[PDB]
Amino acid sequence: GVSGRVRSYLDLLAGLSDFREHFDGSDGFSLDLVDMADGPGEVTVICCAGTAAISGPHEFTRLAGALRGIAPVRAVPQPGYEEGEPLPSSMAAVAAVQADAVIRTQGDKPFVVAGHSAGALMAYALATELLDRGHPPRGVVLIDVYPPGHQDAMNAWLEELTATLFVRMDDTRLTALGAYDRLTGQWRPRETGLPTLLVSAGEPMGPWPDDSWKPTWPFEHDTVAVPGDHFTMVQEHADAIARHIDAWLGG
Template identity: 30%
Template sequence: TSLAWGLWATAGGMAGELGEAEIARLERMGTAALPTELGLELFDRARLVDAAVQVPVLLDLGALRSQARAGLLPPLFRGLVRTQAPQAGSSVGGSLAQRLAGVPDGEREQMVVEVVVAQVAAVLGHASASAVDPERAFRELGIDSLGAVELRNRLTQATGLRLPTTLVFDHPTPAAIARLLLDEVGGDEQAVPAAAESTRDSGTLGALLRHAHTAGAMAEAVPLLTGAARFRPTFASAAELAGDAYVVQLASGSERTKVVCVPSFVVGSSPHQFMRFADAFAGERDVFACTLPGFRDAEPAPATWDAAIEVLAESIVRAVGDGPFVLVGYSTGGVLAHSLAARFEAAGARPAGVVMIDTPMPETEAETNSVFTSVMTQILGREPQAGAISDTDWLAMGAYMRLLAAHTPDPVTVRSLMIRADVSLDGNTWPAWDVADTDVKVAADHFALIEAQAAETAEVTRQWLRHTDPEHTQ
């Protein structure tokens, strides 16, 4: 008998690693902490039930109903609570535009600020929106990586607008997001039907991939994704993107050598994945994170690997200036970071080093299918918590997968570190990429390296930096 336990009230184990904000988030999601006596009683009951898998979790039905009303209830829980069905023709997404229609111009921005602040307060667990200063940065307010995703999902439901996964990073205060929303809605009633189709069932490609996931046929779906990506609009050079910025700052510090993080091109990966990693360097070093071109709505995907590298390189230079920097790439982002290091070397702007976090480099079609089948299975299993994945993002991922398959890495001379996961993902082994000067294993799986155990990954990086940073090697 397998028991999929919920949170226990007793401190220790996995629960002992959770902070107050994380526990509060679980409670808002409807998962309460099991008192020890109740947990033991459920264990005894489970032994008497003839079922292979049971889920002893203490659920707060009131919290689940609140999530359902907000449109945020995971599909797994939808049969547990009843909510009033929306009336025909009603539009949660149009509500913001409808409310703005009768508001004088001088009061419109303040009303949108109140909408945003209310959602920020809900994410942070505040009883009142008055606890949120709209001009303070989200990091100062206490929004972490999961909070950034939750806020984006809540605002998507509240406004009906398709908002980017990098929303909190591109617009780092509630007031900045309010200005964005005001620009998007603009008071034009035509904006109501134009609201994004943000339900998790929207998108033909996404629906097919979810079906493949349910049927256990992800291996067959990988070629579907890469094949469909051939028809995605593309750009061939950075000049075609009008100089957009693709780097945001996550932490600041006094050390001279900066850290520039490059995310994976797997859907759901973005600067928010590096927030826990960046927290470990707060007050010590400037930490930046890239957004990959092609993952913004209506933005074309790169036509070539070099086109993507060109865009990222130009944006990194604008962000870090002339000072030394180290590139840190997570998962397939490590291949991008390695290519960026090669490009900077060729241009005479040699970086101080490159770190790759559990980066695979599949060399055959079979290896490529194996890697992405494993990752996509995990991503689709997490989708209810991470938010719906649009076809736009799936196609961008497919475009990068095609480019990776045709990519031959150039050698680099800068010092390099590979941080490897010592726990397999679904029993699968990554194709080893033996390209780094130094290899370090961390007792975590592929996702935990940048999530639950990001602090350990950051510490390994910090120790390696001490031998790389010009300030410490002179």
């Protein structure tokens, strides 16, 4: 609770964000999904770019590596992080726009909407929009990073938020950061039958002896622990995360 100067810096970046060009459902805006990989998997893994200062399609890069040859991977971007891109005037708009890109660039053929966490809410919002529109996803996948302890997880978060008030980003992204943050933060998710998978890829299976244990995704869901440390070839548990998503989609 020490860094409340983060809330302020964010509240301000958001303010600046309102001067940028916004877009809603009205105006003919639209965007394209990015092809990360292909495989025979009957289910396409549509990934949502978190809203972190960094973020963007590039984040699901390693996951696409693991899925190449296993399933079709395509990422959704968050409009406004790249030069001259508009900012959604509402959670309502952005989910709608993205929603469009999917029904369009997917036609039939099932898909799963998934995100890293920095994109979990957007991922879930998109998921909702699809469902209301009539083209629900097979499911939602939340690839939770961060640690298991309530603190340490809360810390780590502010921790890296400061690293962007510390060789630094740019205007475009810092505004979007303040924008989407304003959005997801104010948005309230509701139930949606959508089966869900929560992958806990955080460090240390369980939280330190200081007993914390953070809150978990409310709404029915299944879970799989996937740490990051052991004995075959210490590098990418991305493939571990990947295979899990698949075996999940096939029971």
